[PDB]
Design a protein around this nucleic acid. Sequence first.
RNA 1: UGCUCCACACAAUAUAGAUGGAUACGAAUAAGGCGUCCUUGUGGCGUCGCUGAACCAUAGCAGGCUAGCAACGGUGCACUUGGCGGAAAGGCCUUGGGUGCUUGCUGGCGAAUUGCAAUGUCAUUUUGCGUGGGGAUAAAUCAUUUGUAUACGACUUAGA
RNA 2: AAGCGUUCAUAGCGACAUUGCUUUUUGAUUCUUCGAUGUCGGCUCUUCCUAUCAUACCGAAGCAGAAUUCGGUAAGCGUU
Lengths: 136, 106, 190, 172, 197
Amino acid sequence: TDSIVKASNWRLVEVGRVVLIKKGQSAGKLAAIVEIIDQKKVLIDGPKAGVPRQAINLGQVVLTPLTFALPRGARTATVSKKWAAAAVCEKWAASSWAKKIAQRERRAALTDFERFQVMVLRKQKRYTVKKALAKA
Amino acid sequence: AESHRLYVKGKHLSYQRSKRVNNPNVSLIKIEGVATPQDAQFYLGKRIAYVYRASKEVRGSKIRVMWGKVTRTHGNSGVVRATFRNNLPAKTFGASVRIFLYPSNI
Amino acid sequence: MKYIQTEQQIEVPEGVTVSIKSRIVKVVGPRGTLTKNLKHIDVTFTKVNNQLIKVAVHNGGRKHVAALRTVKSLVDNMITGVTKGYKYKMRYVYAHFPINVNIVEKDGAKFIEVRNFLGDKKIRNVPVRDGVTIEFSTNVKDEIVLSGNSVEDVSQNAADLQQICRVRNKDIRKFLDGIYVSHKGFITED
Amino acid sequence: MAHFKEYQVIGRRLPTESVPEPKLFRMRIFASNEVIAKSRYWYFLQKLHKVKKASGEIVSINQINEAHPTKVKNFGVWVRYDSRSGTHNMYKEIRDVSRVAAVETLYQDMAARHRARFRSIHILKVAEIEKTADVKRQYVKQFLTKDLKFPLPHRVQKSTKTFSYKRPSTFY
Amino acid sequence: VEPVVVIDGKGHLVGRLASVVAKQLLNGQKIVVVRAEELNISGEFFRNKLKYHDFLRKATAFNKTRGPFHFRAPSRIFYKALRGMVSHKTARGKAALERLKVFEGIPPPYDKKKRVVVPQALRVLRLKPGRKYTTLGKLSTSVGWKYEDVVAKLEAKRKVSSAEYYAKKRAFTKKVASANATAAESDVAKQLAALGY
RNA sequence: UGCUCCACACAAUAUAGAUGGAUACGAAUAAGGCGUCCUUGUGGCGUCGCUGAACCAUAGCAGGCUAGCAACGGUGCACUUGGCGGAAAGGCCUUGGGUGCUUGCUGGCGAAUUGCAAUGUCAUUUUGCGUGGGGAUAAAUCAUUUGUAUACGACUUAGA
RNA sequence: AAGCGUUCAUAGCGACAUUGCUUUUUGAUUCUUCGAUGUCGGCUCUUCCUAUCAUACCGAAGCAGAAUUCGGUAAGCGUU
Ligand SMILES: [Mg+2]
Ligand SMILES: [Mg+2]
Ligand SMILES: [Mg+2]
Ligand SMILES: [Mg+2]
Ligand SMILES: [Mg+2]
Ligand SMILES: [Mg+2]
Ligand SMILES: [Mg+2]
Ligand SMILES: [Mg+2]
C-alpha cells in the first residue's frame, strides 16, 4: 500500500562538489567544482592542495561523494576560505576510499626488511585467527 | 621457501619487423608487470636467459641457455628490444624467457 | 542537441501503488496488477510524495527525450487501466451476410469464432488473450465489447478481430464489411 | 593548426617619398604561431587594401593573452565560411574560459558539423556577450540556469590489465 | 598470469573479445572461453542475421562440401571470428589455436574454476547506451544451431549448484571476516596497520 | 612361458615452453554487492566500490640436526566413514584414527673452496628394459562358400 | 509537369527539356592471341542473374462483380 521506487543515488556535477584529479600534474589531489562550462568541461580549483584554478575535462577527474556549500563562480580566496571552513580535508581523509589510497602508497613504500616484518606479523596474526576459527 | 625465483618472467613475442620483413637480430620481449617505456627503462641492460632442454647431454647437463640483454624500449606498452648472443630459434615465439636483476643499479 | 535534463510527471491516485525497481514497473490497484518491462529505455524514476513520480532523461538527444514522454504514457495507461479499466466497442458491419460472432471454448482456450463473413464456409478463430473479457452487449444491434486491465491486450484483441475480417479480391471501398472499433474508453466513465 | 593563440599584428605599406608614414593597419589573428599569424594577416589585408607582403611590412607582432583567463564567458563568434557550393555567414555561441579556446572549439565544430576546414573559415568576429538573456542559442542557454546540476550516468572505467576478475559496474 | 585463463563470454562483444584472445594465444597464453552463447554483436538482430545469410550464400559452386564451412554454433562462430586475427595457415598459428577451447555454457572442469572478464571488450563498457545489439545464441538458433534449449537447461542445473556453493562460501567468509574483526586492536594488528597490512 | 594392471630400479625419448596458488554465485549496469533488522518486500538501515596495486601463501643445509615453551590449532602422507557431481561426471565436500613437520614464541649446532657471474640441473610426457605382486586364456584376414551384392576391391551369408 | 484523361497535371499516361543505369545490340579502339584459344545454328545438360510471364502473399485504380491495368516482397518453382 506504499509506492516504492529506488532512487539510485548518483554523484552530481555541481558547484561545490569536491573532485579528485586522476590525470595530469595533480593526479591524486582534490579540487572543488567552481563553474560548470558544459556537459563535459568544468572549472575546478584546489588551492588547499596546490591544484591550480583551471578549466578541466570531466573525464580526467573523478567526482567524490563530498560536497560543500560554495557560490557559483567563486574565486580562489573564497574557495580556499570555504574549503577550510567546511573541513573538506579530514572529511575526505576519513573515507575508506582515501584510506585505500594511503594504503597503496604505504604498501609501495615498504622496504625489503619491512616486507619481511609484515610476513612474520601476518603469520603471527593468522595463527590466533585459525585458533579462533577452530573454536567458533 | 616455495619460491626460489630471482628473475622476472618474460615472453618472446617476435623479431623486430616491418609489415613483411623481420630482423632476427633483434627480439621483442614483453616483461611481466611492465606497461610503459618509462617503466621499461629499469630493465635496460639487464641480462636475459632463454632456458630450454634437449635430450642429448652436452656438458654434464640436459639444459641449454641462450643469453641476451635488453637494448632499448619498444613502443608504448612496455615492450623492450633485446639482443642475444645468438638469435632466438623463432619457434620460441610465445615462449618464456627469464629477465634477471643484474647488472643491478637499484 | 543533448538536452541536460528532460522531465515528465506521473500522477498516482491514492487507490494504486506503483513499485518500480530497476525498470520493472508494477502498478497494483483496485482492478489488479499490471507489469511492464522497460529495461530498454534508460530513464530514471524518482518517487516524490506517494502521488507524484518523476521520470527523467539525463544528457539525451532528440530520439531519447521523445521516448521519455512515451514512458510517461505507458505508465499512465497502466494507472488508468487499473483504476478505470479499458473498454473497446466494436460494430459488425455487413451488407448481406449476417456476421455470427460467438465465444467458443475448445479445450479451455477461449477463442472468438466468426462465421458467415461474406458467406464464407471458413470458420475464423481469434484467441482471447489472458486478462480480456468478451461481452456481446444487448440493447444494441451487432456489438461486441472488449474489457480488460491492460490497454495493450484489449486493443490488440481489438485489432486481431478487426484484421481477421479483411476482404480479399474485392473493392474494399464497396465491400465495407468487417468488424471495426467504434469507441475506445474506460469501464467506469459516467 | 595547434592550440591557438591570439596575435596583435600591425602592418603598413612601405613609406614612399610622396606619402611617408602610411596608415599603419592592425588586425587580431588567431594562429598557431607568429609565422601563420603574419601569413593570415597578409591574406586578410589582401581582401581589403591594395597591398601585399612585398609592398608592405609588419611593424609589430604581439601575443594577446586573456584578460581574465579563468572565468567562464559566453562568446558570440561571427564566421564566414565556404561550403561545397557557396559562401555563408553564420553565428555560433560558445561557452568556455578563453577566446583561443572558444575559437579552437569553433574550428572543431565547423569541421565536425559542416566539414569546413581551417582553410575555408573566416573568423568575422569574436565578441563576448556581457549579459545573460542576450544569449540566443538553446545549447548554451541551458547551462545558464539557476543552481545547475546534472549527473553522469554510466561511468566507463579504464583498466590497465587486460583481464578483470570482478565484472565491474557503471555506477557513478 | 594464470596458467589457464577462463573468460566468461557473457556481455562481451565478439570482435573485441576475439581480438584480445588472438593476441593472448600468439603471446603464449592458454585461453578458455565459456558461455559463447551469451556473446554480443553490435547492431540489430535482423542486421546480424542478414550478414550471416550473406555468409551462408558463399559456397564453392562446383562442390559445396569443399567450400566455406558455415558453422552455426556460437562457440564455432566465435572461433571463426578468431581466425582472421590469427595467421591460422602457419605452424605458429596452428600452435596458437591449439591453446584455445571455446564452449557453449560452462562444462566441467571449468564450472568450479574462476572466470574472468575483459573490460576492454565488454558490451556494457564499450557500447553507447541505447544502441541495439544481438545475442549469439539467438542468432545461432535462427541459422540452425540445434542446442539452445539443452544448453539453457544444463546451465540452469549448473547455476543452482553454483548458487548453493556460494551460500556455503558466503557463510564461511562471514565467519572468517568475524575472526579478522576480533583480531584487530591486538599488538600484531596495529603493527600490520602501520605497515599497510 | 606370450598379454595386461600396480610398485620401484635403470636407459632412451622429447617438451609451442612449470619456475608459490587457473583463487568457482547469479543477474543488473539509468544499478549492484556485503552486513543487520523486521511486518519477508521490487522493504528499512548502514557500509563498499573509484580495479587483482587484491586475497591466500611465502623465513629454515632447494631448506639440515636438535633442546624446549605456548596451543590442541595449521598442514603433508598414505588409510578409512558417508555423501554429492553425467555437459566432457574423473572432481568436490566429508567422518575417524595413525604417522611426520610446524617459522605461534625462545634456544644450541652446521653451512665456507661452485673461489667475483655462467639455467647451475630440482619439472612432465612417451618409449623400452629388469625385478616382484595381482588378473584373464581370444579373435581377425586369406583360402573355401552364398548372392539380398558386385568391374576389381568391398558388401551380405555359411563351414569344426 | 505544358497537356490528355467528360470535369482532374501525376488512376493510367505524358510534350518541351534534363539526370542516369546496363553491357544480351551495333558502332568505336587495336591491349591479348597469327611456332593456331577449333569461327554459325541446333541438340543435350547444369548453373547463375532479375529488368517477374505464371505461381504465393499484398498495395493502387477512372477496382460494383467478372475481367483487366499499375506497383511491392519475391528467382522458391515452372515457362511447351
Ligand atoms: Mg620494430
Ligand atoms: Mg475482383
Ligand atoms: Mg588474417
Ligand atoms: Mg543441417
Ligand atoms: Mg615455514
Ligand atoms: Mg595503341
Ligand atoms: Mg590448341
Ligand atoms: Mg524486381
